[PDB]
Amino acid sequence: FYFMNQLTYGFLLMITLLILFSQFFLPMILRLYVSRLFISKL
C-alpha cells in the first residue's frame, strides 16, 4: 500500500542529506583539518 509513502519521504530525506552533508557537515571538519595543518606548518 505505502510504497509511495516510504519512497517519497525517503527520497526527500535523500536530497536533504546530500545537500545537507555537502554544504555543512563535511567541510566543517575539513576546516578543522586545514586549521590544524596551518598551525603546524605555520
Binding site: 505505502y2 510504497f3 509513502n5 516510504q6 519512497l7 519521504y9 525517503g10 527520497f11 530525506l13 535523500m14 536533504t16 542529506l17 546530500l18 545537507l20 552533508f21 555537502s22 555543512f24 557537515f25 563535511l26 566543517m28 571538519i29 578543522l32 586549521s35 590544524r36 598551525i39
Partner: protein
C-alpha cells in the same frame, strides 16, 4: 502520518545530534564526541581514495558519505527492541539501489556516449567467445543492480524477525513447568550473541554497501 516517516525524522535528528551538539564551540582540539565522525571521515577517505583513484576522486566523496551514513544510522535505530523495521522494507532499499544503478548508467553514458559499452569487453579473448563474456556481463550488469539492495534489507528482514521469533521461543520456553527456570540462561546469551551479530549486520553491511558502490563508481566513471 507514518511511523516510518517519523523514523526518517529520528534519522535527521540524530544526524543533527552527531555534529552540532557534538562540537564544543568549534574547538581545534577535536573532543571525544567529534573523534567518532573524525574516524568515520578518515575511514571513508582512505577507502575511496584508493578505491576509485581518480585525479578528480573527491568529487564523488560526498555521495559515498551520505549513502553510507543513512545506512549506518538506520541500522542503529531498529537495534532497540521496541521499534518497527526501518531498513527491512526491501521495496524502499532496492528502489534506492535501482536509483543508484540508473544514475551510474546515466553518468557513464553522458561521460562516454557510445564507448561506455566498452566495459563489456574487459580483457583479451579468442574470437568464438567474445560476445559470450558480453552476454553474462550484461546479465551481470543488472545483477549488479538488483542484488546490492536485495542483500542488505533481506539481512535486516532476516535480522529483527530473528530476534522476534526466538524471543517467542524463549516465551515458549518459560511457561512450561518451573524446571524451565533452572539452566535457562543459555538461550538468553544466545540471543545476546544474536544482537552481537546484529551490530555486525548493521555496520559491516553498510560498509559493504559503500565499498561495492565505490567499485561501481570507479567502473562507471573510468573505463577499466
Amino acid at each position: 502520518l507514518t511511523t516510518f516517516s517519523l523514523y526518517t525524522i529520528i534519522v535527521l535528528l540524530v544526524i543533527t545530534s552527531l555534529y552540532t551538539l557534538t562540537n564544543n564551540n568549534n574547538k581545534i582540539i577535536g573532543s571525544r564526541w567529534l573523534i567518532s565522525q573524525e574516524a568515520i571521515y578518515d575511514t571513508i577517505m582512505n577507502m575511496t581514495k584508493g578505491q576509485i583513484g581518480g585525479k578528480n576522486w573527491g568529487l564523488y566523496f560526498p555521495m559515498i558519505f551520505t549513502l553510507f551514513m543513512f545506512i549506518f544510522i538506520a541500522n542503529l535505530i531498529s537495534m532497540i527492541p521496541y521499534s518497527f523495521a526501518l531498513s527491512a522494507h526491501l521495496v524502499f532499499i532496492i528502489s534506492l539501489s535501482i536509483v543508484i544503478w540508473l544514475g551510474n548508467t546515466i553518468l557513464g553514458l553522458y561521460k562516454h556516449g557510445w564507448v561506455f559499452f566498452s566495459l563489456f569487453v574487459p580483457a583479451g579473448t579468442p574470437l568464438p567467445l567474445v560476445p559470450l563474456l558480453v552476454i553474462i556481463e550484461t546479465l551481470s550488469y543488472f545483477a549488479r543492480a538488483i542484488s546490492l539492495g536485495l542483500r542488505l534489507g533481506s539481512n535486516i528482514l532476516a535480522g529483527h524477525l530473528l530476534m522476534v521469533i526466538l524471543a517467542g521461543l524463549t516465551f515458549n520456553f518459560m511457561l512450561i513447568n518451573l524446571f524451565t527456570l533452572v539452566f535457562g540462561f543459555v538461550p538468553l546469551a544466545m540471543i545476546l550473541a544474536i544482537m552481537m551479530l546484529e551490530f555486525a549486520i548493521g555496520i559491516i553491511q553498510g560498509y559493504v554497501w559503500a565499498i561495492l558502490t565505490a567499485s561501481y563508481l570507479k567502473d562507471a566513471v573510468y573505463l577499466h
